[PDB]
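Q: Hi! New to this. If I give you a protein sequence and the SMILES for fe (iii) ion, can you show me the bound structure?
A: Yes, paste them in.
Q: Okay, here:
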Amino acid sequence: ISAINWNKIQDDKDLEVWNRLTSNFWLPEKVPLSNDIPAWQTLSAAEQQLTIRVFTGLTLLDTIQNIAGAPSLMADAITPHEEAVLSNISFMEAVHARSYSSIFSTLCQTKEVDAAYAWSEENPPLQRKAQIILAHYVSDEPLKKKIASVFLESFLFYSGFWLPMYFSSRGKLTNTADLIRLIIRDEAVHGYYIGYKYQIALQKLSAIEREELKLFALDLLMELYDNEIRYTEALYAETGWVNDVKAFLCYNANKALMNLGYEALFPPEMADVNPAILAALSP
Amino acid sequence: ISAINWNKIQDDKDLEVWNRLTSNFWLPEKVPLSNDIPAWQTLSAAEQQLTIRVFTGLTLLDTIQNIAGAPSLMADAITPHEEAVLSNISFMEAVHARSYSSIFSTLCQTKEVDAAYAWSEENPPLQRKAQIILAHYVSDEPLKKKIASVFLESFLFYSGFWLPMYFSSRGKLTNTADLIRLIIRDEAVHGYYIGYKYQIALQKLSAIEREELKLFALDLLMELYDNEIRYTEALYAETGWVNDVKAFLCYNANKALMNLGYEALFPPEMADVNPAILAAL
Ligand SMILES: [Fe+3]
Ligand SMILES: [Fe+3]
Ligand SMILES: [Fe+3]
Ligand SMILES: [Fe+3]
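A: Thanks. Here is the predicted structure of the protein with fe (iii) ion bound:
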């Protein structure tokens, strides 16, 4: 271990990402969440349960990324500066996770929150995706680890991010949505960066190896995609929003794929997101 | 793994420290380091070299704490909130270390800097304490890892922090001193928190194990103490300040022990640091 020298950058992107991520630092306390209290009261009991469950699902994924994911990529960094950026990513995943408790504390009741957490421990689709990702994080295959990480950063949270964006388009939970956008602002960069590092590693492999990884990527995606469909149908049952969430899933699945350097897999007719959602996503 | 719940804190100190460290977030870019350029030219060749070398050493430690330290402590966390707090500590360690490149960048030449790093790779004492600490961080002794970290956080740093606080009292490099002060504000809580967690683990050990760990701590503190002596009287050789530095490190060695729940090791006579310096702290 040698002292790190930030005046001898080996890959400029490391410094760009470091500056963008650190400059985008934030904490949930900085978001006036209490201003969503009236909006929360206008949601149905069903909608409130849905929101809480979705957020607990998001929390599990962030907790994993903070605990196992990010730190898992550490031993695979190719530059000392990458290691520093990964430590920031890990910390921010902790802030992301913590933010949901801030939301629960401000808007919800202890009883209903505890029930949601119980639900998360038992939901098959949720535990299945958590299991799939973790298995890759504990393995010894660095590139399958980055593929899983990108799918988590750019795909797996979106069945959840969709809800606050929808509510916001109706003028509800807008401050919660603002917070979600700060989280998304981070995840988008995380996925971009990890995907970038994955691409660099590919060039150091043969053509036969790069081809294996490509096939692995598409198979893992289909596995996660189908399980996410089941996760979505169950959570959004009877809301009438299932097909919109699915479109949002394909939309983000293509971005995850592109972050790994591959071409979009889902055609426009499966990834046609309602412009209202796209607008709320980036006003 | 379960989703963390910050509305079910298992130890209030976890929330306290999380709020302290996150509220105290900062970046070097936020410090007017440039306003020290004029004051940096007043320094001599020896001083400048000393400062750059001192800062390089500190940089290696933060790099270690960032890569090996804090990370190795996560597997030993006893609450989910502690794991989150440790990830913040690891992150800020990267910020601390990055700060030095920010300082070298605003007040030095690639020539000088590249020299201090070359030195860093060879200096015996420096490479030794780094070897000692990493040895524990990689071991499977959770409590020894915490003793090590507390020594790194509350002792092995001040051997350098002395200098920036000296210039500060003399009115030189006051901005850089503000930066260092920010680092200290973090390091101080880190040593306290990890030492706090160390003590909770102790109460759960046998009486004989508590004794063994106590003696061990002292054995490690001295091994690092004498090696820091060689480091000090060698780096501050041609300065005549070595005396002050020796007084400062004994001051911090005792603080490091308090953080572990132990009594002072060096008598006040050996820990009487120049009040002016303690003022810059
Ligand atoms: Fe996240
Ligand atoms: Fe992320
Ligand atoms: Fe530090
Ligand atoms: Fe520290």
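A: The two ends of chain A are 45 Å apart (CA to CA). Let me know if you'd like me to explain how to read the tokens.
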